[PDB]
Design an enzyme around this catalytic site. Sequence first.
Site, short mmCIF file in Angstrom:
data_model
loop_
_atom_site.label_atom_id
_atom_site.label_comp_id
_atom_site.label_asym_id
_atom_site.label_seq_id
_atom_site.Cartn_x
_atom_site.Cartn_y
_atom_site.Cartn_z
N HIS A 299 -34.95 -30.00 -20.56
CA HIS A 299 -35.39 -31.37 -20.42
C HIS A 299 -34.24 -32.33 -20.17
O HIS A 299 -34.40 -33.54 -20.36
CB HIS A 299 -36.16 -31.80 -21.67
CG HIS A 299 -37.24 -32.81 -21.40
ND1 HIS A 299 -38.41 -32.49 -20.74
CD2 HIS A 299 -37.31 -34.13 -21.70
CE1 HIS A 299 -39.16 -33.58 -20.65
NE2 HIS A 299 -38.52 -34.58 -21.22
N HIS B 128 -24.17 -38.97 -14.19
CA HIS B 128 -25.57 -38.93 -14.58
C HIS B 128 -26.45 -38.96 -13.34
O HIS B 128 -26.19 -39.72 -12.40
CB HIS B 128 -25.93 -40.10 -15.50
CG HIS B 128 -27.20 -39.91 -16.25
ND1 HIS B 128 -27.66 -40.83 -17.18
CD2 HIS B 128 -28.12 -38.92 -16.23
CE1 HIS B 128 -28.80 -40.40 -17.69
NE2 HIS B 128 -29.10 -39.24 -17.13
N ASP C 231 -24.53 -37.86 -23.95
CA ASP C 231 -24.75 -36.54 -24.52
C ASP C 231 -23.46 -35.97 -25.07
O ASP C 231 -23.44 -35.40 -26.17
CB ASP C 231 -25.34 -35.61 -23.46
CG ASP C 231 -25.58 -34.20 -23.99
OD1 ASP C 231 -25.74 -34.04 -25.22
OD2 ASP C 231 -25.60 -33.26 -23.17
#
Lengths: 58, 414, 413, 154, 58, 58, 58
Positions: free
Chosen positions: C232, C271, C327
Site C-alpha cells: 500500500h 515521492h 516514511d
Amino acid sequence: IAAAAYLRLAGRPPVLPSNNFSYSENFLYMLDSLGNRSYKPNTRLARVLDILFILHAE
Amino acid sequence: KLYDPGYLNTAPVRSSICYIDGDEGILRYRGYPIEELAESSSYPEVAYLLMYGNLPSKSQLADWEFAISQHSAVPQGVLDIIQGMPHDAHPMGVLVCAMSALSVFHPDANPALRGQDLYKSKQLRDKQIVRILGKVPTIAAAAYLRLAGRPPVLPSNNFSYSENFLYMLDSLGNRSYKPNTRLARVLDILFILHAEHEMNCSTAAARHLASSGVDVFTALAGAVGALYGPLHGGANEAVLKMLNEIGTVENIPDFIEGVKNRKRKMSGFGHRVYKNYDPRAKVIRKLAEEVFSIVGRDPLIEVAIALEKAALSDEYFIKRKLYPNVDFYSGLIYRAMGFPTEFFPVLFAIPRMAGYLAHWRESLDDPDTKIMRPQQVYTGVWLRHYTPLQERTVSNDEDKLGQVAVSNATRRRL
Amino acid sequence: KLYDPGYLNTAPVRSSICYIDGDEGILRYRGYPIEELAESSSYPEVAYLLMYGNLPSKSQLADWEFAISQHSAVPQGVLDIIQGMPHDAHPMGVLVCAMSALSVFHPDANPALRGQDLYKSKQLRDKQIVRILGKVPTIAAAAYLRLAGRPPVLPSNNFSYSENFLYMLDSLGNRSYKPNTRLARVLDILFILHAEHEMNCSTAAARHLASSGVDVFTALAGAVGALYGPLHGGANEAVLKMLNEIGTVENIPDFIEGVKNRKRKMSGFGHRVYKNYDPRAKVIRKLAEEVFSIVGRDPLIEVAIALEKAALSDEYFIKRKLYPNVDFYSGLIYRAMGFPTEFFPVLFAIPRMAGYLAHWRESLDDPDTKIMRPQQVYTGVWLRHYTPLQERTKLGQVAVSNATRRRLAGSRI
Amino acid sequence: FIEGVKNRKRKMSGFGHRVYKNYDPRAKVIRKLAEEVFSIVGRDPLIEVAIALEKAALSDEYFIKRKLYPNVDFYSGLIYRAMGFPTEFFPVLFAIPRMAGYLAHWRESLDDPDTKIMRPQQVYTGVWLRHYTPLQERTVAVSNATRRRLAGSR
Amino acid sequence: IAAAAYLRLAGRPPVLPSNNFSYSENFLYMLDSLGNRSYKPNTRLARVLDILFILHAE
Amino acid sequence: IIQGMPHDAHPMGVLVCAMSALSVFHPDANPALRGQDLYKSKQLRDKQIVRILGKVPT
Amino acid sequence: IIQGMPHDAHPMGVLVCAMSALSVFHPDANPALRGQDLYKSKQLRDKQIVRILGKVPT
C-alpha cells in the site's frame, strides 16, 4: 450463587467472596469488582440493597 | 461522465467466467447453461470448470476431489476459537472469525512472512485453493453442530463433496453413517445454482484485495464478510415472515385481495436481475417436490403452495412479472432439511466462495490490471487558517452524544 | 460502458472530508493545513474535526475524549480469543482476528438481526465511533504484549489517548510507571501526520460495505486487512534493509555511485505524490532529532543521518527531485523507540482509522449512495455445450513429497 | 547467472572438494541413487532446476578452466528434499554417520596409553609487568541494550 | 533419539522401537508408522538411505 | 529437566545439561545458521558474556 | 505413589506402601467405618478374601 449467575450472564468467570463486609455490601461487591480485591462499593447503594432485601423478606 | 458513482457508466475490468443476460435470464458458465449443469453434473465439476476455465476429465477430476477430501484437516485451534464465541452468535460472524483464524494459523501463506514469492507460481496458488475449498465445508459444519451444543465431528474420506458435508452434518458419532442419497444430490444441485454472480460489492472488494497483494485467506474472509449484508442474503426472512404472519391457509385469497388493496406486503416475486423467466425456478420446484416426498410437509409448505397457486391466477401478479424467485423454494427446502433460520446465510456462502476464488486467480494472471486509485472531488472549504483550539470559539454545543454507560453510569458511580 | 484500467481514471465519489495536493504539498483537513494543526493540535481534536466537520468546543472535546477513555475498556471474550491464538504468529493477523471477534461480540450493533434501520439513528453511529476509536489501541497493545507473552493490563482511565497507549505498552505491569511526557507528545504529534491519506482500496471498500448495510465492525476489519500488506506504499522495510546493507559512512559512496550508475536501488527518496518540499518532512525531522536527543542513537542511526546529509546536497538528488520521505524519518523514530520492525505496520494502521470512520459516517448520512453493481466486458467463449462424463478424457499435485513420500516412499500399508 | 558467477559478483558452491579433486566416487554413487530416487518418488521444481544447472554449468568454460565438479553436497541436498526431510533436519542426518567415527577414535584412544596430550607451550604477547592501584583514583559502553527498558523506565 | 526429534518436530506423539530388521530399515520403520505397527521399509529406500549414511561415515 | 532427573545423579552433569538447554533456549544467539559473519559485532559479545556470567551461578 | 518416587532400597518398602494405600483406595472394603464390625459378615469376608488373594498382582 446469585453472583455466579450474574457473572455467567455476561461471560465473566466467578468471583471469590470477600469476607469482611456486610451482607448487601458482600453481594454488591461480588457483582462489580472485576477480580479486584481492593474495591469498596458505595455505602448508600449497599444501604439501598439492604432496604430492598428487608422489604421482601416473606 | 467524470462522476460515475455506482460504476453503472464504467467497467472496472473485463471478465470471462460467465455472462449474465438479466433481461432474458441467459446464464452460461463458460458456455454451459446453468440448468444443464445442475441436472447432468455435480459441484466439483463446475467448480473446476470455472477455476481452470474448462471442465476436467475423469482422471484429474478424481485426483482433485481426492485432494479436496484430503485437506479437510481443520486445525483444532480454530475449533477452540469456535468454543470461544457464545452459542448465541450468528453463524456469519463465527465463519468470518474462523476464516481470519485459519488465515493466521497457516504461516506458509503470509507473503509478509516470506516476501512477494508465494503468489508467482501455480503450485502455491493451486495448493491454497484446494486447502481452503476443503476447509470451508467443515468449519461450517462445526458451526452447525455448535449451534445446538454438540461436540465437533471428524470429517471422513468416504463420500463425495456434498455428501461429505451431509455426512459430517448428521453422523452423531456413528462412523457407519451414510445419509440419504437424494438429499445429497439435491444439495449438490443447490450448490450448482448459487455457484457465481458477476461483479458485485463482494466481488469488487475481492478483486481489490487480490490486487492489494495480501494473503488470499484474509481476502476471502473479507469478501464473504461483505456477503453478511441483509441486502446480500437477508431477504429470505422477508418471505419467511410473509408465509409465517399469514398463518392459516384460509387467509390466502383474502391476503392476495388485500395485496390488491395496497395493504399487504409483496416480496420474493420476480428477480431483480431477471424479469422474464428463470429455469432455476422449475428445476428447484421439481427438487422441492422431491424434498416434500422424502421428508414430508408442514402448514407453512401448504400455505406457500396454495398462495403461489393463487398468485399465478390473479392478474395483479401476472402483469407485473411477479413470478416467484428461487428464494421461496430455497428456504422451503432448507428448513425442510431441518435448518434454523439464522443458519441460512452461511450455506449460501459455501458455493459463492469458489467463484470468488476463480476471479481471484483471474486478476492475478492479468497485470494490465493494477493497483486501484480512486479520484476524489473535494467540495468543502478550500483554505482557512486554523484558530487556536483554545481561542477556539465556544458558541456551538450540538449533536450532544453524551450517552454511553451501564444503566445511566451506575456501573462505577461508587 | 467505460473500461476503467487500474481505477485511476475518473472520480467515482465526491466528498467534503479532506483535501490533498501532493505536487503542491498542501494537506488541509477540511481547509485546515497540516502544519497549523500538527505543530499545535492533538489527535482527538483532529478526530473530532473529521467526525463533525468542524473544530470542537472545550466542553465538547473534553467529554469526547472522556468518553473515549471510558470506552477504552475491551471485552473479556475477545481477550480470551487473543489468548487462544498461537505465540509466534504475526500480530497484525491477531489484530484482524480480534476485530472480527469484536464484530461477533457486539450483536447489539448487528443490523441483520434488526433490519436495515438500526443504522439510521443518530446516537448509535456516535457510540460505534467511540467504541472503535477506544477499543482498537488496547487491542494493538495487547497483541504487542502477546509477542512478549505477558498478560494484558487493563487500560488506565486517567491519561491522554497517546499517553494511554504508551502506558499500556510500557507499564511494566504495575501502576507505579510515570509517562514520559516528551515521548508522549512526540508520538501524539506524530499521529496527526498519519491520519486519513488519499483515497485507496480501503476507503472505497469501506464506502461499499457501509452502502451495503453490513455491520461496521466487519467492514473495518476488511479495511485493516486491506492495509495488511506493505504494498500500500509502506516501504519502511526498503530503507531498513538499505541501512542494514549500507554499512558505515565509508562504504556508502559505492552504493550511491551504483545508484547513479543505475546499479543499486534507491528507496525512500522522492515521492510519487510529492514533487516538492514536504512540511511533514521538516516537522518529523524536528521530532526525530528530539528523539535522538532523548533516547540516543545506535551506529545505524548516525549512518542514516550522515547518508541523508551527504545525499541531500548531492546533485543526483537535487536535480532528480529526490529527497527523503516521511516514511524514512518515521521508521527512524520508531526504531529509536525500539519497536520490532515487523510490528511497524500496526503503528501505520492505528491512525488510519479516523478517516475510515469519517467516510463510513459520511456515506451513511448522504443519500447519494446506490447499488454497487459494477460492469464488465465478456471475453470468454460465448457458447459451448455439455459433454458426457465418459466423454471426458493437471498443473500440479497437492502434498508433494510431504505425506506422500510418507505414504509410499517407505511402504503402502 | 552463468555469466554472473564468472563476473565474481555472485559465488557458486556445490561443485567439487577442498580436499578431494581428482574425484569423489561418493558423488558418482549418489548421482546413481539420485536417478533412482527420481524414479521412485518423482520430480519437483527444485529437482529439474538442479538437473538443468548440472547439464548447463558443465558446458560453460568456467568449470572447464576453474574445475568445480558437482560436490556430494548437491546430490545429498536434493535427495534430502526428495525423502520428505524438512529443510532444517539435514545437520542431524549428517550427525548420524559420524558417531561411528567418534566411537572408533574413542575406543582406539582408550586402547593406547602411550599416546598423551601434553601441556602445550605458549609465548606471552602481553606486558611483562604491571601493578595494582586501588580504584578510587581510577582515572576516566554497549553492555546492555537500551531504548527498550531504559525508555520503559524513563 | 534422532527419529524422536523428527517425529516430535511435527508435534505428533512419539513411537516405540522395533527389533525385527537391521539398522537403516529398522530406523525407517521407526520413521513411518502413523500409529500402524504393521508397516515395512521400502527396500530400495532403505538401501539408498543406508548408502547416504555410509558416504559421510568418517 | 533437573527436577525430572532422579535423586541419584551427578550435579555437574546437571550443569552441562541445563547449559546445553541454554544453548537451546537462545536460538537467536547462534551464528551456526546465519553465516560465519553474524558475530562481527561487539554488542553480541557483550550480551553473551554478561548473560553467561549472570546465568551460571544461579 | 510410585512411577517417579526414588528407589534407595528394595521395592519391599514400595510394596508395603502400595498395599497400605490399597487399604484406602477401596474404603468400601473396611469394617471400621460401618457399624462396628463387618468381617463377621460372610459375604463381605468372602469378597474381601477373593480380592485380596487376587489384588496383589496389579
